[PDB]
PDB file of all heavy atoms in Angstrom:
ATOM      1  N   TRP X 778       6.595   2.942   7.013  1.00  0.00           N
ATOM      2  CA  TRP X 778       7.637   2.049   6.513  1.00  0.00           C
ATOM      3  C   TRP X 778       8.977   2.731   6.764  1.00  0.00           C
ATOM      4  O   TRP X 778       9.355   3.664   6.052  1.00  0.00           O
ATOM      5  CB  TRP X 778       7.428   1.735   5.037  1.00  0.00           C
ATOM      6  CG  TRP X 778       8.530   0.918   4.442  1.00  0.00           C
ATOM      7  CD1 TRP X 778       8.899  -0.345   4.801  1.00  0.00           C
ATOM      8  CD2 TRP X 778       9.403   1.303   3.374  1.00  0.00           C
ATOM      9  NE1 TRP X 778       9.951  -0.768   4.026  1.00  0.00           N
ATOM     10  CE2 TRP X 778      10.278   0.224   3.142  1.00  0.00           C
ATOM     11  CE3 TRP X 778       9.529   2.455   2.593  1.00  0.00           C
ATOM     12  CZ2 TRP X 778      11.268   0.265   2.162  1.00  0.00           C
ATOM     13  CZ3 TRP X 778      10.512   2.492   1.621  1.00  0.00           C
ATOM     14  CH2 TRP X 778      11.369   1.406   1.416  1.00  0.00           C
ATOM     15  N   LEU X 779       9.694   2.261   7.780  1.00  0.00           N
ATOM     16  CA  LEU X 779      10.916   2.899   8.246  1.00  0.00           C
ATOM     17  C   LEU X 779      12.123   2.074   7.825  1.00  0.00           C
ATOM     18  O   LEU X 779      12.156   0.858   8.044  1.00  0.00           O
ATOM     19  CB  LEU X 779      10.905   3.066   9.768  1.00  0.00           C
ATOM     20  CG  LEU X 779       9.667   3.691  10.415  1.00  0.00           C
ATOM     21  CD1 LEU X 779       8.651   2.625  10.801  1.00  0.00           C
ATOM     22  CD2 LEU X 779      10.059   4.521  11.626  1.00  0.00           C
ATOM     23  N   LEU X 780      13.108   2.737   7.227  1.00  0.00           N
ATOM     24  CA  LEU X 780      14.370   2.089   6.902  1.00  0.00           C
ATOM     25  C   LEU X 780      15.211   1.958   8.163  1.00  0.00           C
ATOM     26  O   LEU X 780      15.457   2.947   8.861  1.00  0.00           O
ATOM     27  CB  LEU X 780      15.126   2.890   5.842  1.00  0.00           C
ATOM     28  CG  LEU X 780      14.389   3.173   4.534  1.00  0.00           C
ATOM     29  CD1 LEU X 780      15.242   4.039   3.625  1.00  0.00           C
ATOM     30  CD2 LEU X 780      14.012   1.877   3.841  1.00  0.00           C
ATOM     31  N   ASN X 781      15.659   0.737   8.453  1.00  0.00           N
ATOM     32  CA  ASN X 781      16.441   0.491   9.658  1.00  0.00           C
ATOM     33  C   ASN X 781      17.855   1.038   9.500  1.00  0.00           C
ATOM     34  O   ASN X 781      18.826   0.276   9.452  1.00  0.00           O
ATOM     35  CB  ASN X 781      16.467  -1.005   9.984  1.00  0.00           C
ATOM     36  CG  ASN X 781      16.666  -1.867   8.754  1.00  0.00           C
ATOM     37  OD1 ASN X 781      16.454  -1.419   7.627  1.00  0.00           O
ATOM     38  ND2 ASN X 781      17.066  -3.115   8.965  1.00  0.00           N
ATOM     39  N   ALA X 782      17.971   2.358   9.422  1.00  0.00           N
ATOM     40  CA  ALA X 782      19.247   3.034   9.238  1.00  0.00           C
ATOM     41  C   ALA X 782      19.160   4.387   9.934  1.00  0.00           C
ATOM     42  O   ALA X 782      18.280   4.612  10.771  1.00  0.00           O
ATOM     43  CB  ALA X 782      19.587   3.143   7.742  1.00  0.00           C
ATOM     44  N   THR X 783      20.078   5.290   9.600  1.00  0.00           N
ATOM     45  CA  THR X 783      20.058   6.624  10.178  1.00  0.00           C
ATOM     46  C   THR X 783      18.821   7.390   9.719  1.00  0.00           C
ATOM     47  O   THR X 783      18.302   7.180   8.619  1.00  0.00           O
ATOM     48  CB  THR X 783      21.321   7.396   9.798  1.00  0.00           C
ATOM     49  OG1 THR X 783      21.379   7.549   8.375  1.00  0.00           O
ATOM     50  CG2 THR X 783      22.559   6.651  10.272  1.00  0.00           C
ATOM     51  N   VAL X 784      18.344   8.284  10.588  1.00  0.00           N
ATOM     52  CA  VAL X 784      17.140   9.054  10.286  1.00  0.00           C
ATOM     53  C   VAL X 784      17.369   9.955   9.079  1.00  0.00           C
ATOM     54  O   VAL X 784      16.491  10.097   8.217  1.00  0.00           O
ATOM     55  CB  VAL X 784      16.698   9.863  11.520  1.00  0.00           C
ATOM     56  CG1 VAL X 784      15.377  10.568  11.251  1.00  0.00           C
ATOM     57  CG2 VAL X 784      16.595   8.959  12.739  1.00  0.00           C
ATOM     58  N   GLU X 785      18.544  10.584   9.000  1.00  0.00           N
ATOM     59  CA  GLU X 785      18.826  11.488   7.889  1.00  0.00           C
ATOM     60  C   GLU X 785      18.786  10.753   6.554  1.00  0.00           C
ATOM     61  O   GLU X 785      18.226  11.261   5.576  1.00  0.00           O
ATOM     62  CB  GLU X 785      20.183  12.163   8.096  1.00  0.00           C
ATOM     63  CG  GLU X 785      20.448  13.356   7.182  1.00  0.00           C
ATOM     64  CD  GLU X 785      20.988  12.955   5.822  1.00  0.00           C
ATOM     65  OE1 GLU X 785      21.503  11.826   5.693  1.00  0.00           O
ATOM     66  OE2 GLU X 785      20.896  13.772   4.881  1.00  0.00           O
ATOM     67  N   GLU X 786      19.376   9.557   6.495  1.00  0.00           N
ATOM     68  CA  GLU X 786      19.317   8.767   5.269  1.00  0.00           C
ATOM     69  C   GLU X 786      17.890   8.331   4.967  1.00  0.00           C
ATOM     70  O   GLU X 786      17.502   8.210   3.799  1.00  0.00           O
ATOM     71  CB  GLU X 786      20.238   7.553   5.380  1.00  0.00           C
ATOM     72  N   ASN X 787      17.095   8.084   6.011  1.00  0.00           N
ATOM     73  CA  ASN X 787      15.694   7.734   5.811  1.00  0.00           C
ATOM     74  C   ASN X 787      14.935   8.876   5.146  1.00  0.00           C
ATOM     75  O   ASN X 787      14.099   8.647   4.264  1.00  0.00           O
ATOM     76  CB  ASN X 787      15.055   7.364   7.150  1.00  0.00           C
ATOM     77  CG  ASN X 787      13.704   6.691   6.993  1.00  0.00           C
ATOM     78  OD1 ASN X 787      13.568   5.489   7.225  1.00  0.00           O
ATOM     79  ND2 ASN X 787      12.694   7.464   6.613  1.00  0.00           N
ATOM     80  N   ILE X 788      15.212  10.115   5.560  1.00  0.00           N
ATOM     81  CA  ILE X 788      14.520  11.267   4.986  1.00  0.00           C
ATOM     82  C   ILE X 788      14.867  11.418   3.511  1.00  0.00           C
ATOM     83  O   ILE X 788      13.988  11.628   2.665  1.00  0.00           O
ATOM     84  CB  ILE X 788      14.859  12.544   5.777  1.00  0.00           C
ATOM     85  CG1 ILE X 788      14.475  12.381   7.248  1.00  0.00           C
ATOM     86  CG2 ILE X 788      14.155  13.748   5.171  1.00  0.00           C
ATOM     87  CD1 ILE X 788      14.874  13.556   8.114  1.00  0.00           C
ATOM     88  N   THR X 789      16.157  11.319   3.180  1.00  0.00           N
ATOM     89  CA  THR X 789      16.586  11.522   1.798  1.00  0.00           C
ATOM     90  C   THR X 789      16.010  10.453   0.879  1.00  0.00           C
ATOM     91  O   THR X 789      15.383  10.768  -0.139  1.00  0.00           O
ATOM     92  CB  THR X 789      18.112  11.533   1.722  1.00  0.00           C
ATOM     93  OG1 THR X 789      18.625  10.281   2.197  1.00  0.00           O
ATOM     94  CG2 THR X 789      18.678  12.662   2.571  1.00  0.00           C
ATOM     95  N   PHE X 790      16.200   9.182   1.232  1.00  0.00           N
ATOM     96  CA  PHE X 790      15.657   8.045   0.488  1.00  0.00           C
ATOM     97  C   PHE X 790      16.086   8.095  -0.982  1.00  0.00           C
ATOM     98  O   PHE X 790      15.280   8.257  -1.899  1.00  0.00           O
ATOM     99  CB  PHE X 790      14.132   7.991   0.631  1.00  0.00           C
ATOM    100  CG  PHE X 790      13.514   6.729   0.101  1.00  0.00           C
ATOM    101  CD1 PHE X 790      13.658   5.534   0.782  1.00  0.00           C
ATOM    102  CD2 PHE X 790      12.774   6.742  -1.071  1.00  0.00           C
ATOM    103  CE1 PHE X 790      13.087   4.372   0.299  1.00  0.00           C
ATOM    104  CE2 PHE X 790      12.201   5.583  -1.559  1.00  0.00           C
ATOM    105  CZ  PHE X 790      12.357   4.398  -0.872  1.00  0.00           C
ATOM    106  N   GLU X 791      17.400   7.964  -1.171  1.00  0.00           N
ATOM    107  CA  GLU X 791      18.013   7.935  -2.502  1.00  0.00           C
ATOM    108  C   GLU X 791      17.679   9.192  -3.302  1.00  0.00           C
ATOM    109  O   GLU X 791      17.288   9.123  -4.469  1.00  0.00           O
ATOM    110  CB  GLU X 791      17.605   6.676  -3.271  1.00  0.00           C
ATOM    111  N   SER X 792      17.834  10.350  -2.669  1.00  0.00           N
ATOM    112  CA  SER X 792      17.594  11.635  -3.304  1.00  0.00           C
ATOM    113  C   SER X 792      18.754  12.574  -3.014  1.00  0.00           C
ATOM    114  O   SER X 792      19.425  12.438  -1.987  1.00  0.00           O
ATOM    115  CB  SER X 792      16.283  12.263  -2.807  1.00  0.00           C
ATOM    116  OG  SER X 792      15.179  11.416  -3.079  1.00  0.00           O
ATOM    117  N   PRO X 793      19.021  13.529  -3.907  1.00  0.00           N
ATOM    118  CA  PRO X 793      20.117  14.474  -3.665  1.00  0.00           C
ATOM    119  C   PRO X 793      19.883  15.289  -2.401  1.00  0.00           C
ATOM    120  O   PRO X 793      18.751  15.643  -2.067  1.00  0.00           O
ATOM    121  CB  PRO X 793      20.109  15.359  -4.917  1.00  0.00           C
ATOM    122  CG  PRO X 793      18.742  15.190  -5.500  1.00  0.00           C
ATOM    123  CD  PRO X 793      18.354  13.777  -5.196  1.00  0.00           C
ATOM    124  N   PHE X 794      20.973  15.585  -1.699  1.00  0.00           N
ATOM    125  CA  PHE X 794      20.924  16.282  -0.419  1.00  0.00           C
ATOM    126  C   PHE X 794      21.173  17.768  -0.650  1.00  0.00           C
ATOM    127  O   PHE X 794      22.249  18.162  -1.113  1.00  0.00           O
ATOM    128  CB  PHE X 794      21.948  15.699   0.553  1.00  0.00           C
ATOM    129  CG  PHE X 794      22.097  16.487   1.823  1.00  0.00           C
ATOM    130  CD1 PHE X 794      21.160  16.377   2.837  1.00  0.00           C
ATOM    131  CD2 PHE X 794      23.178  17.334   2.007  1.00  0.00           C
ATOM    132  CE1 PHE X 794      21.296  17.101   4.008  1.00  0.00           C
ATOM    133  CE2 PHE X 794      23.319  18.059   3.176  1.00  0.00           C
ATOM    134  CZ  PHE X 794      22.377  17.942   4.177  1.00  0.00           C
ATOM    135  N   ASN X 795      20.178  18.587  -0.326  1.00  0.00           N
ATOM    136  CA  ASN X 795      20.301  20.038  -0.352  1.00  0.00           C
ATOM    137  C   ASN X 795      20.035  20.575   1.047  1.00  0.00           C
ATOM    138  O   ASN X 795      19.009  20.251   1.654  1.00  0.00           O
ATOM    139  CB  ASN X 795      19.329  20.657  -1.359  1.00  0.00           C
ATOM    140  N   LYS X 796      20.964  21.389   1.556  1.00  0.00           N
ATOM    141  CA  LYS X 796      20.831  21.900   2.917  1.00  0.00           C
ATOM    142  C   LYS X 796      19.578  22.751   3.070  1.00  0.00           C
ATOM    143  O   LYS X 796      18.854  22.630   4.066  1.00  0.00           O
ATOM    144  CB  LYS X 796      22.076  22.701   3.300  1.00  0.00           C
ATOM    145  CG  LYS X 796      23.358  21.886   3.297  1.00  0.00           C
ATOM    146  CD  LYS X 796      24.551  22.725   3.729  1.00  0.00           C
ATOM    147  CE  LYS X 796      25.835  21.911   3.699  1.00  0.00           C
ATOM    148  NZ  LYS X 796      27.015  22.717   4.113  1.00  0.00           N
ATOM    149  N   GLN X 797      19.306  23.622   2.097  1.00  0.00           N
ATOM    150  CA  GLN X 797      18.098  24.439   2.151  1.00  0.00           C
ATOM    151  C   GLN X 797      16.846  23.577   2.053  1.00  0.00           C
ATOM    152  O   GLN X 797      15.884  23.777   2.803  1.00  0.00           O
ATOM    153  CB  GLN X 797      18.118  25.487   1.037  1.00  0.00           C
ATOM    154  CG  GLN X 797      19.177  26.572   1.203  1.00  0.00           C
ATOM    155  CD  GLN X 797      20.584  26.086   0.901  1.00  0.00           C
ATOM    156  OE1 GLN X 797      20.783  24.952   0.462  1.00  0.00           O
ATOM    157  NE2 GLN X 797      21.569  26.945   1.135  1.00  0.00           N
ATOM    158  N   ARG X 798      16.840  22.612   1.130  1.00  0.00           N
ATOM    159  CA  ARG X 798      15.689  21.728   0.990  1.00  0.00           C
ATOM    160  C   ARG X 798      15.500  20.863   2.230  1.00  0.00           C
ATOM    161  O   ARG X 798      14.370  20.672   2.695  1.00  0.00           O
ATOM    162  CB  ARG X 798      15.844  20.858  -0.257  1.00  0.00           C
ATOM    163  N   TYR X 799      16.595  20.327   2.778  1.00  0.00           N
ATOM    164  CA  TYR X 799      16.494  19.526   3.994  1.00  0.00           C
ATOM    165  C   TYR X 799      15.992  20.363   5.163  1.00  0.00           C
ATOM    166  O   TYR X 799      15.148  19.908   5.945  1.00  0.00           O
ATOM    167  CB  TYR X 799      17.851  18.901   4.324  1.00  0.00           C
ATOM    168  CG  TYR X 799      17.833  17.972   5.519  1.00  0.00           C
ATOM    169  CD1 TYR X 799      17.536  16.622   5.370  1.00  0.00           C
ATOM    170  CD2 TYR X 799      18.117  18.442   6.795  1.00  0.00           C
ATOM    171  CE1 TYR X 799      17.520  15.769   6.458  1.00  0.00           C
ATOM    172  CE2 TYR X 799      18.103  17.597   7.888  1.00  0.00           C
ATOM    173  CZ  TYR X 799      17.805  16.262   7.714  1.00  0.00           C
ATOM    174  OH  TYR X 799      17.790  15.418   8.801  1.00  0.00           O
ATOM    175  N   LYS X 800      16.502  21.589   5.300  1.00  0.00           N
ATOM    176  CA  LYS X 800      16.052  22.459   6.380  1.00  0.00           C
ATOM    177  C   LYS X 800      14.597  22.868   6.186  1.00  0.00           C
ATOM    178  O   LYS X 800      13.849  23.003   7.162  1.00  0.00           O
ATOM    179  CB  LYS X 800      16.951  23.691   6.472  1.00  0.00           C
ATOM    180  CG  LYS X 800      16.862  24.426   7.798  1.00  0.00           C
ATOM    181  CD  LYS X 800      17.320  23.541   8.946  1.00  0.00           C
ATOM    182  CE  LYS X 800      17.300  24.295  10.268  1.00  0.00           C
ATOM    183  NZ  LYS X 800      17.760  23.444  11.400  1.00  0.00           N
ATOM    184  N   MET X 801      14.182  23.082   4.935  1.00  0.00           N
ATOM    185  CA  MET X 801      12.786  23.414   4.667  1.00  0.00           C
ATOM    186  C   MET X 801      11.861  22.269   5.057  1.00  0.00           C
ATOM    187  O   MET X 801      10.797  22.493   5.645  1.00  0.00           O
ATOM    188  CB  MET X 801      12.606  23.769   3.191  1.00  0.00           C
ATOM    189  N   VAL X 802      12.247  21.033   4.736  1.00  0.00           N
ATOM    190  CA  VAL X 802      11.404  19.885   5.047  1.00  0.00           C
ATOM    191  C   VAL X 802      11.364  19.641   6.551  1.00  0.00           C
ATOM    192  O   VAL X 802      10.296  19.402   7.128  1.00  0.00           O
ATOM    193  CB  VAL X 802      11.889  18.641   4.281  1.00  0.00           C
ATOM    194  CG1 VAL X 802      11.158  17.400   4.768  1.00  0.00           C
ATOM    195  CG2 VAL X 802      11.681  18.831   2.788  1.00  0.00           C
ATOM    196  N   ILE X 803      12.525  19.698   7.210  1.00  0.00           N
ATOM    197  CA  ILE X 803      12.560  19.456   8.649  1.00  0.00           C
ATOM    198  C   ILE X 803      11.804  20.547   9.397  1.00  0.00           C
ATOM    199  O   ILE X 803      11.280  20.310  10.492  1.00  0.00           O
ATOM    200  CB  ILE X 803      14.015  19.324   9.145  1.00  0.00           C
ATOM    201  CG1 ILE X 803      14.053  18.669  10.525  1.00  0.00           C
ATOM    202  CG2 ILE X 803      14.697  20.677   9.207  1.00  0.00           C
ATOM    203  CD1 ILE X 803      15.448  18.507  11.088  1.00  0.00           C
ATOM    204  N   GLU X 804      11.730  21.754   8.829  1.00  0.00           N
ATOM    205  CA  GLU X 804      10.905  22.798   9.426  1.00  0.00           C
ATOM    206  C   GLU X 804       9.424  22.492   9.251  1.00  0.00           C
ATOM    207  O   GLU X 804       8.633  22.661  10.188  1.00  0.00           O
ATOM    208  CB  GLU X 804      11.251  24.155   8.815  1.00  0.00           C
ATOM    209  N   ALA X 805       9.028  22.046   8.057  1.00  0.00           N
ATOM    210  CA  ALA X 805       7.642  21.648   7.838  1.00  0.00           C
ATOM    211  C   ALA X 805       7.290  20.406   8.646  1.00  0.00           C
ATOM    212  O   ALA X 805       6.196  20.317   9.216  1.00  0.00           O
ATOM    213  CB  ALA X 805       7.393  21.410   6.348  1.00  0.00           C
ATOM    214  N   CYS X 806       8.204  19.437   8.709  1.00  0.00           N
ATOM    215  CA  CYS X 806       7.979  18.236   9.503  1.00  0.00           C
ATOM    216  C   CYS X 806       8.131  18.484  10.997  1.00  0.00           C
ATOM    217  O   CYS X 806       7.686  17.651  11.794  1.00  0.00           O
ATOM    218  CB  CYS X 806       8.940  17.128   9.067  1.00  0.00           C
ATOM    219  N   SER X 807       8.738  19.608  11.387  1.00  0.00           N
ATOM    220  CA  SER X 807       8.970  19.944  12.793  1.00  0.00           C
ATOM    221  C   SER X 807       9.729  18.829  13.508  1.00  0.00           C
ATOM    222  O   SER X 807       9.433  18.477  14.652  1.00  0.00           O
ATOM    223  CB  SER X 807       7.656  20.260  13.511  1.00  0.00           C
ATOM    224  OG  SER X 807       6.827  19.114  13.601  1.00  0.00           O
ATOM    225  N   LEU X 808      10.720  18.266  12.823  1.00  0.00           N
ATOM    226  CA  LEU X 808      11.522  17.177  13.364  1.00  0.00           C
ATOM    227  C   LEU X 808      12.722  17.666  14.163  1.00  0.00           C
ATOM    228  O   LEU X 808      13.526  16.841  14.612  1.00  0.00           O
ATOM    229  CB  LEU X 808      11.997  16.258  12.234  1.00  0.00           C
ATOM    230  N   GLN X 809      12.868  18.980  14.338  1.00  0.00           N
ATOM    231  CA  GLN X 809      13.968  19.507  15.143  1.00  0.00           C
ATOM    232  C   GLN X 809      13.954  18.987  16.577  1.00  0.00           C
ATOM    233  O   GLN X 809      15.022  18.582  17.069  1.00  0.00           O
ATOM    234  CB  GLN X 809      13.945  21.040  15.098  1.00  0.00           C
ATOM    235  CG  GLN X 809      15.022  21.714  15.937  1.00  0.00           C
ATOM    236  CD  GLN X 809      16.400  21.625  15.310  1.00  0.00           C
ATOM    237  OE1 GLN X 809      16.549  21.200  14.165  1.00  0.00           O
ATOM    238  NE2 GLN X 809      17.417  22.031  16.061  1.00  0.00           N
ATOM    239  N   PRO X 810      12.826  18.977  17.304  1.00  0.00           N
ATOM    240  CA  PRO X 810      12.857  18.383  18.652  1.00  0.00           C
ATOM    241  C   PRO X 810      13.233  16.911  18.654  1.00  0.00           C
ATOM    242  O   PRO X 810      13.904  16.449  19.585  1.00  0.00           O
ATOM    243  CB  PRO X 810      11.426  18.603  19.166  1.00  0.00           C
ATOM    244  CG  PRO X 810      10.906  19.741  18.366  1.00  0.00           C
ATOM    245  CD  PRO X 810      11.509  19.572  17.009  1.00  0.00           C
ATOM    246  N   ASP X 811      12.812  16.158  17.635  1.00  0.00           N
ATOM    247  CA  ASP X 811      13.119  14.732  17.593  1.00  0.00           C
ATOM    248  C   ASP X 811      14.617  14.490  17.457  1.00  0.00           C
ATOM    249  O   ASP X 811      15.175  13.611  18.125  1.00  0.00           O
ATOM    250  CB  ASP X 811      12.361  14.067  16.443  1.00  0.00           C
ATOM    251  N   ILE X 812      15.286  15.258  16.595  1.00  0.00           N
ATOM    252  CA  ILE X 812      16.723  15.085  16.409  1.00  0.00           C
ATOM    253  C   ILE X 812      17.484  15.543  17.647  1.00  0.00           C
ATOM    254  O   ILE X 812      18.433  14.883  18.088  1.00  0.00           O
ATOM    255  CB  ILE X 812      17.191  15.833  15.148  1.00  0.00           C
ATOM    256  N   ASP X 813      17.088  16.680  18.222  1.00  0.00           N
ATOM    257  CA  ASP X 813      17.793  17.211  19.386  1.00  0.00           C
ATOM    258  C   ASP X 813      17.647  16.293  20.594  1.00  0.00           C
ATOM    259  O   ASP X 813      18.595  16.118  21.367  1.00  0.00           O
ATOM    260  CB  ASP X 813      17.282  18.614  19.714  1.00  0.00           C
ATOM    261  N   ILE X 814      16.461  15.707  20.780  1.00  0.00           N
ATOM    262  CA  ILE X 814      16.230  14.837  21.931  1.00  0.00           C
ATOM    263  C   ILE X 814      17.131  13.611  21.868  1.00  0.00           C
ATOM    264  O   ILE X 814      17.707  13.193  22.881  1.00  0.00           O
ATOM    265  CB  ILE X 814      14.744  14.443  22.014  1.00  0.00           C
ATOM    266  N   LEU X 815      17.263  13.014  20.691  1.00  0.00           N
ATOM    267  CA  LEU X 815      18.104  11.833  20.544  1.00  0.00           C
ATOM    268  C   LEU X 815      19.568  12.201  20.762  1.00  0.00           C
ATOM    269  O   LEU X 815      20.046  13.185  20.187  1.00  0.00           O
ATOM    270  CB  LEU X 815      17.913  11.213  19.161  1.00  0.00           C
ATOM    271  CG  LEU X 815      16.503  10.707  18.855  1.00  0.00           C
ATOM    272  CD1 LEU X 815      16.408  10.203  17.424  1.00  0.00           C
ATOM    273  CD2 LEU X 815      16.102   9.618  19.839  1.00  0.00           C
ATOM    274  N   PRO X 816      20.303  11.451  21.589  1.00  0.00           N
ATOM    275  CA  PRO X 816      21.724  11.774  21.801  1.00  0.00           C
ATOM    276  C   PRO X 816      22.559  11.709  20.535  1.00  0.00           C
ATOM    277  O   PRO X 816      23.508  12.489  20.390  1.00  0.00           O
ATOM    278  CB  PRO X 816      22.169  10.725  22.830  1.00  0.00           C
ATOM    279  CG  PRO X 816      21.194   9.601  22.676  1.00  0.00           C
ATOM    280  CD  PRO X 816      19.889  10.250  22.333  1.00  0.00           C
ATOM    281  N   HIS X 817      22.237  10.803  19.613  1.00  0.00           N
ATOM    282  CA  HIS X 817      22.954  10.680  18.352  1.00  0.00           C
ATOM    283  C   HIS X 817      22.312  11.489  17.233  1.00  0.00           C
ATOM    284  O   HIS X 817      22.766  11.415  16.088  1.00  0.00           O
ATOM    285  CB  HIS X 817      23.056   9.209  17.944  1.00  0.00           C
ATOM    286  N   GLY X 818      21.270  12.259  17.538  1.00  0.00           N
ATOM    287  CA  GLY X 818      20.642  13.079  16.515  1.00  0.00           C
ATOM    288  C   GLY X 818      19.910  12.227  15.499  1.00  0.00           C
ATOM    289  O   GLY X 818      19.299  11.206  15.832  1.00  0.00           O
ATOM    290  N   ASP X 819      19.970  12.647  14.238  1.00  0.00           N
ATOM    291  CA  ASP X 819      19.320  11.938  13.145  1.00  0.00           C
ATOM    292  C   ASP X 819      20.167  10.795  12.598  1.00  0.00           C
ATOM    293  O   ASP X 819      19.868  10.279  11.516  1.00  0.00           O
ATOM    294  CB  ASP X 819      18.967  12.916  12.020  1.00  0.00           C
ATOM    295  CG  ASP X 819      20.123  13.824  11.651  1.00  0.00           C
ATOM    296  OD1 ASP X 819      21.008  14.037  12.505  1.00  0.00           O
ATOM    297  OD2 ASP X 819      20.144  14.328  10.508  1.00  0.00           O
TER     298      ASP X 819
END
């Protein structure tokens, strides 16, 4: 179930944004190649 918006906002999903927490999740999700490949990123 994907929100038709930015990827970063999709990840947060009405939750507080923490750089360490976001980096920890994106490391576990291994979404770094996905963001880098896209020209507009997340």
